[PDB]
Design an enzyme around this catalytic site. Structure first.
Site, PDB file in Angstrom:
ATOM      1  CG  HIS A   1      -2.218  -0.981   0.803  1.00 33.15           C
ATOM      2  ND1 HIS A   1      -3.121  -1.392   1.775  1.00 33.15           N
ATOM      3  CD2 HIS A   1      -2.577  -1.626  -0.332  1.00 33.15           C
ATOM      4  CE1 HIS A   1      -3.949  -2.277   1.258  1.00 33.15           C
ATOM      5  NE2 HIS A   1      -3.643  -2.445  -0.017  1.00 33.15           N
TER       6      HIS A   1
ATOM      7  CG  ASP B   1      -1.838  -0.248   4.930  1.00 32.79           C
ATOM      8  OD1 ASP B   1      -2.083  -1.125   5.736  1.00 32.79           O
ATOM      9  OD2 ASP B   1      -2.578  -0.031   3.999  1.00 32.79           O
TER      10      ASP B   1
END
Lengths: 349, 349
Positions: free
Chosen positions: B199, B287
């Site tokens: 991500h 993330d």
């Protein structure tokens, strides 16, 4: 009226060679590409057109033999990508003579220093080597023997090695190139490398677009507000490095606006400039080797932190599998290894 | 048949709550949003549809009062973005009791550890806290009271604190959730955070596209070969961290192909996934805080270098003006401060 050797017959090379020839100097021009030299020879002239310079020029000589172009020149203008400077210095070493003036257009970061180091290593005579941080012309050559010149800068910073010879140097080219203006020393011109800020970062932040060849206006669409703000924080590192040597070089904004985003969005000149269409781009190859690398090395010397420059440098190296910290311009290549901040200042005087 | 508290009524929350209710357990569900709880109450059910799960479910209770949902639960499933774990632990601290099983779905990196630390700080009773590194369901709720379920994973790694209670834990949910499979400890699940790799990086390398809201298929167009190769070098750092604790966690490739590019280009499931349309995205917020940050902190502990993870971390922080190294999951938040690599291993047993 004098003899000028113009090395490199790319866009800029074309423009200088025409400019000089239209101004009544003797021009000897070279390019590594025989073929290109051969096409221009056939045409018999260089055609300049456009608002900035128009005329049919006649260099006195076109050759792919470097020594022939250099041996008899009074002034030698080098107009190639900074990544090629080293090679050219090594190649002309045997032809130069005491009394010649060499000017790197431009020098990127540390062009004159690197140039001086190679010449001395090759036992060349001592000569004056200058550098400019900008390109005199905005032009484009559609084919060999032709160049479109939009414009010619009205003022250009110029510095040389040794710095005391700046006046003499300018006394030499002054009649033909009055645009050059002397700054303190080569640290000033070399630390005024705006491309080291504007090229590598935005390209990195548009990596996929570039790799995929997805068209975009480099300045207009590649630099959004946050990308401009990040570039400003990288610029601040450059500036902090300049201040540590006691120099006041201009910020990217001053070089053009309260922000980079404003500056860039607002120059109509950037209307139509596309981003790279692959990753094998000069915005990395040249601007990282001859810009970010030396900047980082320098900051390390004067003990000024450059976390953002380093971060960009490290990501690009890995992104394209090129060890730029090894291949770019290190303090060693500049002949500045083991010098203290003051030693470096003393080396350029 | 038991009592399950489902915390968070987002996409996943909807799916678990339906799944459990259709399987004859008593379900008490909560969500911080009163409004949302109010819309589902009006509808009187949760409708599940799709290949993975179809049915009209009836939770026993829907409330926005956390203690009411938790106080009487046997198992507590937490289904929120990892960035919210801390807040939830602090809020339920007063309602938990010795004997309950808490499961974080999923835990991101260090969810159970962070969770344990906050509960002890708030003088809660000792309970078993588990975490999974994956999401059981692939689903989407178009509106409150509804969820489309494409599929349900057939196997899920599961680990808990304390690790010896893994069997008991699984003995508890086994009849209803046989998908969970015990791994050694929470370091295994926490170091198997593929999102921390997939991500943040690709988003960073598509920053301008995302900021500008320029549509693109995240996986298909955002990850070109060189972007996949860079991700693989970041993954290697994760893996090196796992090896330093004696764990064999799977590479991103194994998690799905000889390369990430191949893996991603080849999953038809990624057909139609768009990249972020702005920079205020979970791919960064979640993330980075609950993935990159702890990974970096951990590598620092076991003395394993993570130059690429750090480079990405530093560029994103500056890119969005968020000090993630301060706000994310530090060794301190995990209750691992001043522990040696072995001490850390001992803390999870």
């Amino acid at each position: 009226s004098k003899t000028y050797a113009v090395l490199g017959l790319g866009n800029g090379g074309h423009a200088f060679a025409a400019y000089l020839a239209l101004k009544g100097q003797s021009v000897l021009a070279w390019d590594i590409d025989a073929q290109r030299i051969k096409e221009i020879q056939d045409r018999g002239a260089i055609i300049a057109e456009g608002p900035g310079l128009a005329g049919t020029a006649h260099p006195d000589l076109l050759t792919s033999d470097i020594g022939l172009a250099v041996k008899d020149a009074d002034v030698i203008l080098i107009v190639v990508p900074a990544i090629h400077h080293a090679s050219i210095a090594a190649n002309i070493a045997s032809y130069i003579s005491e009394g010649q003036l060499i000017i790197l257009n431009p020098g990127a970061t540390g062009g004159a220093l690197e140039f001086r180091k190679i010449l001395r290593e090759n036992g060349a005579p001592e000569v004056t080597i200058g550098e400019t941080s900008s390109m005199l012309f905005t032009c484009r050559s559609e084919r060999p023997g032709q160049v479109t010149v939009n414009a010619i800068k009205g003022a250009m910073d110029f510095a040389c090695l040794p710095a005391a010879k700046a006046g003499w140097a300018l006394e030499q080219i002054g009649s033909v190139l009055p645009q050059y203006v002397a700054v303190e020393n080569v640290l000033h011109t070399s630390l005024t490398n705006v491309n080291a800020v504007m090229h590598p970062l935005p390209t990195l932040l548009n990596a996929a677009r570039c790799e995929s060849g997805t068209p975009f206006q480099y300045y207009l669409e590649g630099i959004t507000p946050s990308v401009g703000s990040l570039a400003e924080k990288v610029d601040a590192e450059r500036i902090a490095i300049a201040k540590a040597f006691d120099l006041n070089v201009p910020s990217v904004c001053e070089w053009y606006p309260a922000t980079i985003y404003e500056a860039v969005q607002g120059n109509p000149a950037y209307r139509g400039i596309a981003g790279p269409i692959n990753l094998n781009t000069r915005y990395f190859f040249e601007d990282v080797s001859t810009g970010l690398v030396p900047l980082s090395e320098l900051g390390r010397a004067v003990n000024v932190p450059t976390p953002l420059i380093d971060a960009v440098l490290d990501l690009i190296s890995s992104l394209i599998d090129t060890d730029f910290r090894k291949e770019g311009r290190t303090l060693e290549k500049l002949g500045l290894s083991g010098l203290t901040a003051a030693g470096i200042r003393s080396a350029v005087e």
